[PDB]
């Protein structure tokens, strides 16, 4: 059950200790490197193009509506515990990307195939058993969080606000999905490179617009979050179920800390060493949770700090849009627009995430089948009725989660050694 979350975060504590809080110091340099200009040394696409691919998958309706679900059910304190998920999770994502170096490229052009299923093959053979299990899960798990959750949330949200959107929204999402992923990952890096920054800058500025117009409410909004999350007034650590569990569960969803579904994109980077790309990847969480999600969480609390009628019982995606429209003139239109790109981003990335784990099982023979399935399932997800889709998604992600976490624990020695190589290269 949810013991895996105690396991998942436990690695985050563990690796951060073993890696001595590496994330706080390396973060600026990795940020400089990730967005640095001008490198071509054995890779499918740029470091930047890999990050935008990973961020496209990492940024999803969980950033828009998954936080809202956590804010209502777990209280505003869930945001802080979402942060702890990312901060300690930074090390987890890094360890994922480092170990992705034990990757062998596939046939049908370079394409290259790196991921946790490969680590397990290069573990201490059981790893063959774990890797085939991981691919078995991840190949399925991609449809939930990567396809069905994101494709349904937009479809319903668009139908509420604009209402000329039965299957029509499903159709255009399928066409635009097929066009990009037709040309494989090389095509994906093109689209995710342009889409993601335009998406993120669009959303984040509006939040800073909201904060600018209501400056005074900022610090108390921080206060209620910090006052919550550490509110033991009720129950002996009974906020574990309230704020911590919802903060972690939803937080892991948005930033995808240790699900092992991150470095799959990191492998395609043109990297000299694992450490080069693994630092740019570790920035995936920071942009998702600390930047995007925190932007989303701040607006939600501010509306709660205000009075505002009728938002008291709003489900999730509608809550943030209503919370935005409350504070900003066209906030509702902004959020629903972002939701379209936010989900579309996650469809493409998670397609590659699911592909490569699928091909591990079947080879490149069925890659065409996976792509066409993903496009078809994307169409169905908008039309079909998936009320509790998040719940089954979290199970698949947890099913995906169990093996990779074991690997990161066992292969902690490899990465820490492999790190002591790259950081030595960083003095020259």
């Amino acid at each position, epitope marked *: 059950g949810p013991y895996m979350l105690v396991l998942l975060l436990g690695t985050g504590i563990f690796l951060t200790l073993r890696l001595g809080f590496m994330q706080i110091h390396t973060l600026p340099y990795a940020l400089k490197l990730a967005f640095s200009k001008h490198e071509t040394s054995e890779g499918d696409i740029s470091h930047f193009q890999a990050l935008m691919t990973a961020l496209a998958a990492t940024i999803g309706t969980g950033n828009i509506a998954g936080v809202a679900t956590a804010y209502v059910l777990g209280g505003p304190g869930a945001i802080f515990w979402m942060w702890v998920t990312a901060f300690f999770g930074m090390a987890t994502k890094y360890a994922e990307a480092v170990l992705a170096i034990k990757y062998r490229t596939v046939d049908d052009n370079g394409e290259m195939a790196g991921g946790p299923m490969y680590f397990l093959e290069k573990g201490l053979p059981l790893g063959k058993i774990l890797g085939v299990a991981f691919a078995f899960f991840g190949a399925f798990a991609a449809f939930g969080i990567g396809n069905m959750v994101q494709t349904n949330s937009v479809a319903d*949200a668009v139908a509420s606000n604009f209402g000329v959107d039965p299957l029509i929204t499903g159709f255009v999402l399928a066409i635009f999905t097929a066009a990009v992923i037709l040309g494989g990952i090389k095509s994906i890096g093109k689209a995710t490179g342009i889409i993601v920054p335009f998406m993120a800058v669009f959303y984040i500025l509006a939040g800073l617009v909201i904060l600018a117009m209501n400056i005074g409410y900022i610090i108390p909004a921080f206060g209620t979050i910090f006052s919550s999350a550490f509110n033991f007034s009720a129950g002996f650590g009974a906020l574990i*179920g309230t704020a911590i569990m919802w903060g972690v569960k939803r937080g892991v969803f948005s930033n995808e800390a240790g699900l092992g579904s991150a470095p799959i994109a990191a492998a395609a980077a043109k990297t000299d060493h694992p450490g080069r790309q693994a630092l740019v990847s570790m920035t995936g969480t920071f942009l998702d949770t600390i930047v995007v999600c925190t932007i989303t969480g701040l607006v939600l609390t501010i509306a709660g700090l205000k009075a505002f009628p009728g938002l008291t019982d709003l489900t999730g995606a509608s809550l943030t849009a209503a919370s935005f429209d409350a504070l900003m003139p066209m906030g509702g239109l902004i959020v629903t627009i972002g939701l379209v790109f936010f989900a579309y981003s996650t469809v493409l990335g998670w397609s590659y995430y699911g592909e490569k784990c699928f091909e591990y099982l079947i080879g490149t023979k069925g890659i065409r089948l996976y792509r066409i399935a993903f496009v078809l399932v994307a169409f169905w997800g908008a039309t079909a009725s998936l009320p509790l889709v998040w719940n089954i998604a979290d199970t698949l992600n947890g099913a995906m989660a169990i093996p990779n976490l074991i690997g990161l624990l066992l292969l902690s020695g490899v990465v820490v050694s492999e790190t002591k190589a790259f950081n030595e290269i960083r003095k020259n």
Partner: antibody, heavy 114, light 108 residues
Framework: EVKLEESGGGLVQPGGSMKLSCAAS????????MDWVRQSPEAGLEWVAE??????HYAESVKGRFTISRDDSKSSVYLQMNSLRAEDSGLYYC?????????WGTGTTVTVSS | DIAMTQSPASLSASVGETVTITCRTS??????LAWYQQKQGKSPQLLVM???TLAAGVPSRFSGSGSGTAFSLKINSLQPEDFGSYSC?????????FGGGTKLEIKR
């Protein structure tokens, strides 16, 4: 303030069909997910159906015999019941859902008997 | 299915005293428990949301507490206007269930 008025209740023979209505006003039917809750003549209070604007969920007791629909243009929610049973007798209440059922309807009465 | 059992099934309270009502359920549900009050010819009225949080416009005498596997609804200094049936509901999932109900009556 907020308005929820149910309608369409009546007397229907077992195996029959009818659809209820819940004209809503005072807020945005489109943004909120809506529920149908029914109370038996013995104060049962049983949940029936869920809907948001696209997808729906049903209780196992009625799965396949109830159809919940919505019309955000006409700001009304529907519940279509067919192949009715005697146990379907109760007061059918309209309401909007999230975690607690705060804003409730008037209630309309269904009697299934020969 | 989650089964929530309420006790006592019915009680009579001498006016002006304090009473405590219990809703107990099969499995742990965190803080996702809500309380209502229903009167003759009326829909249920929300009293306490999410175990302890307080609804607006409902008098302060009503208080609810508990988490997990023990819930209690507490009324301080009852009044004859509190005569009715008190029901509990949980938000575990989307098929929210309800209790059998507790009938509150008045002593004279």
């Amino acid at each position: 303030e907020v308005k929820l008025e149910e309608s369409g209740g009546g007397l229907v023979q077992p195996g029959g069909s009818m659809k209820l209505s819940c004209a809503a006003s005072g807020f945005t039917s489109s943004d909120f997910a809506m529920d149908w809750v029914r109370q038996s003549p013995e104060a049962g209070l049983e949940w029936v159906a869920e809907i948001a604007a696209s997808e729906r969920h049903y209780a196992e007791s009625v799965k396949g015999r109830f159809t919940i629909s919505r019309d955000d243009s006409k700001s009304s929610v529907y519940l279509q019941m067919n192949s009715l049973r005697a146990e379907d007798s109760g007061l059918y209440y309209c309401t909007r859902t999230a975690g607690a059922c705060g804003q409730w309807g008037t209630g309309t009465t269904v009697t299934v008997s020969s | 299915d989650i089964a929530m059992t309420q006790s006592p099934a019915s009680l009579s309270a001498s006016v002006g005293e304090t009473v405590t009502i219990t809703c107990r359920t099969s499995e742990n549900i965190a803080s996702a428990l809500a309380w209502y009050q229903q009167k003759q010819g009326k829909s249920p009225q929300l009293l306490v949301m999410n175990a302890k949080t307080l609804a607006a416009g409902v008098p302060s005498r009503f208080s609810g507490s508990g988490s997990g596997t023990a819930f209690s609804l507490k009324i301080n200094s009852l009044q004859p206007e509190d005569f009715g049936s008190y029901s509990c509901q949980h938000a575990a999932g989307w098929l929210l269930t309800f209790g059998g109900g507790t009938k509150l009556e008045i002593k004279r």
